[model samples]
Target: MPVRAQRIQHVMQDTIINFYSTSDDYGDFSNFAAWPIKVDGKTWPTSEHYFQAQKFLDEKYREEIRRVSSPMVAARMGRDRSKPLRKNWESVKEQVMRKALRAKFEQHAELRALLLATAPAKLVEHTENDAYWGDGGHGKGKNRLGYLLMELREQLAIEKLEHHHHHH
Candidate 1:
């Protein structure tokens, strides 16, 4: 599929998950700590705080980092077997770390607001599509969102790191 089509599909999926599973019980924010106890030996925390933290790391952090870095690494390594190595695991890992940090920072309302305010309007236009409902008509856009978030996070980290590096 074309990149544009794929992107639209991704947006549609995101809209669906955000509207349904994500928004159903949890507003913009979710606290998984309150989940009902069902099984033992799971080793999961019962407290809402712990659950939220774990959820953030699992759902928000790890997922996004992988998404943003995976494709770049693949492209760098050359999909055709004829291209030179543009990236390696170490470079990709560093990029992922930078991205994770940016994603974590986004949890802060102030930083989030700043980002939203500064981001291009086109980037969020997909939020208006109705296809985001039911199977998102595109598959797991929520999963894509995790990666996109990581990509954005990495971009943010690069900017911050450059600024800090120059100043300090």
Candidate 2:
């Protein structure tokens, strides 16, 4: 798929915002940094540009914002104190974000049907089992960023029957 479609969308972007700022004393926006990796022409607009503009972050949480500069960084700051990152952090990040954006197709029955009709290998290399993104390249708390890819694929597999039946 083209880079534009592969990029993060509003649903996944909002998930990133809530993950980073919901617990802040009030800092839901205006303090985070730019994407560590280039996106959207090798440079996505900063998270601050898209987060809640009406709600500026509190000064006290400025440092907190600094810590979660990007989505991967925020993944580490889970309130419960999450596990260390997968050994293959770079590969994991790309796969997870792509999975998040594509998963949105599941929300619309037509789109979901189209997604289901496509082959699993095309959607992703599940056999690669890159664990960090899912059950494993042979990897688990099993993140949605990770878990959802597998889950939705499983859904698509079953959906094939329902979809085929509908047309007939």
Best by TM-score: 2
> What value does the lDDT take at residue 74 in candidate 2?
40
TM-scores of the models, in the given order?
Answer: 0.22, 0.27
For residue 6, model 1's alpha carbon misses the true position, in angstroms, by 32
User: lDDT scores for all predictions?
Assistant: 0.32, 0.34
lDDT of 1 by residue, 36-155 (tens): 222222221222222222223345532332233233332233223342323453244334333333433344444344333322322221232233212233553233333444356457
Best by lDDT: 2
lDDT of 1 at 108: 48
RMSD to the hidden true structure, all candidates: 18.7, 14.9
Q: After superposition, how far is residue 161 of candidate 1 from its true place, in Å?
A: 0.5
RMSD in Å for model 2: 14.9
What's the lDDT for candidate 1? 0.32
lDDT of 2 by residue, 14-110 (tens): 1322122223321211122232323333222233322211122334343453435465444333322133434554355445454333434443343
lDDT of 1 at 143: 37
